Scaffold this active site. Structure first.
Site, PDB file in Angstrom:
ATOM      1  CG  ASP A   1     -10.521  -1.788   9.999  1.00 61.45           C
ATOM      2  OD1 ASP A   1      -9.438  -2.384   9.836  1.00 61.45           O
ATOM      3  OD2 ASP A   1     -11.474  -1.848   9.191  1.00 61.45           O
TER       4      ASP A   1
ATOM      5  CB  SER B   1       7.003  -9.863   5.981  1.00 63.10           C
ATOM      6  OG  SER B   1       7.648 -10.883   6.723  1.00 63.10           O
TER       7      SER B   1
END
Length: 330
Positions: free
Chosen positions: A35, A199
């Protein structure tokens, strides 16, 4: 040194991925959820409340000759999705795919929430976010990667998740045969303890690319892709019959639909998530309403590039002095 381990979806939907991890001496192999969105290595154990264990493999520290109680240490974690676990702490030898760390903090669960109990295939978590999020008290502990880092040939690990198929986590090297084209690297902020990046935009299907900054986290422990409501609405508007259902908990679509791809930007590069990756199947057995793999992050408070996004790429987690993230198509 290096390590390389195969990671395998837990079910037919890729709800999560498990990777075998050797703990203790002799080895006890547990299948852990790697994770990059958390920083605790915790396991089901001989100390876990019996009624809260349902099929998991447990770590028994008393059977490990290298286990040592970390005196006075406790841990307690509450994940964003409302799941939780807590317990005490041992140090022990932990190996992943041939890479060994001695003195790793192995957090032994005394209590786990129902979501963990009900997932018989996940024996615990191995956190790969920054150690500043580790919950051990009163002395915070380091992640497996942080402990291994100085010994690694290069201070990196990579995630190569499969779509409905096994994939790979590598530590200490970049497998140049595992991706196509070039890897595009992008800046990371560690201010919130995550692999947080921005992004450069998105496209829906064969549509034009929209240049827009989307700050979010690369999070292998989250199944889906969580993005701003504007972006998510633009995606689902291209699927006939798709709607957001408060009762179901997000966007659903007719199972008879063909889903468009979704592209996200990494610098000037583009990662394309095929439409099939966005299908999470019937909302309940036999239903013709299917659950979407792109959902709104509104009210999460952060955008999350979870498995839906990451499995479309070869992803480099570069833990150099100034960390960065790299993405390549594959």
């Amino acid at each position: 040194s290096t390590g390389s381990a195969t990671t395998t979806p837990i079910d037919s939907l890729d709800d999560a991925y498990i990777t075998p991890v050797q703990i203790g001496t002799p080895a006890q192999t547990l299948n852990l959820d790697f994770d990059t969105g958390s920083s605790d290595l915790w396991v089901f154990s001989s100390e876990t409340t019996a009624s809260e264990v349902d099929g998991q493999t447990i770590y028994t520290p008393s059977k490990s000759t290298t286990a040592k109680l970390l005196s006075g240490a406790t841990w307690s974690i509450s994940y964003g999705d409302g799941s939780s676990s807590s317990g005490d702490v041992y140090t022990d030898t932990v190996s992943v795919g041939g890479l060994t760390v001695t003195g790793q903090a192995v957090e032994s669960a005394k209590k786990v929430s129902s979501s963990f109990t009900e997932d018989s295939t996940i024996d615990g978590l191995l956190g790969l976010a920054f150690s500043t999020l580790n919950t051990v008290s009163p002395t915070q502990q380091k992640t497996f990667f942080d402990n291994a880092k100085a010994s690694l040939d290069s201070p990196v690990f990579t995630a190569d998740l499969g779509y409905h198929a096994p994939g790979t986590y590598n530590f200490g090297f970049i497998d140049t045969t595992a991706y196509t084209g070039s890897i595009t690297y992008t800046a990371v902020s560690t201010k919130q303890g995550f692999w947080e990046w921005t992004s450069t935009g998105y496209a829906v299907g064969s549509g034009t690319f929209k240049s827009t900054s989307i700050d979010g986290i690369a999070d292998t422990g989250t199944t889906l892709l969580y993005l701003p409501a504007t972006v998510v609405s633009a995606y689902w508007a291209q699927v006939s019959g798709a709607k957001s259902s408060s009762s179901v908990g997000g966007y659903v679509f007719p199972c008879s639909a063909t889903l468009p791809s979704f592209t996200f930007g990494v610098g000037s590069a583009r990662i394309v998530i095929p439409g099939d990756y966005i299908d999470f199947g019937p909302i309940s057995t036999g239903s013709s309403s299917c659950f979407g793999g792109i959902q709104s992050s509104a009210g999460i408070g952060i955008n999350i590039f979870g498995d839906v996004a990451l499995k479309a790429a070869f992803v480099v987690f570069n833990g150099a002095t100034t960390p960065t993230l790299g993405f390549a198509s594959k």
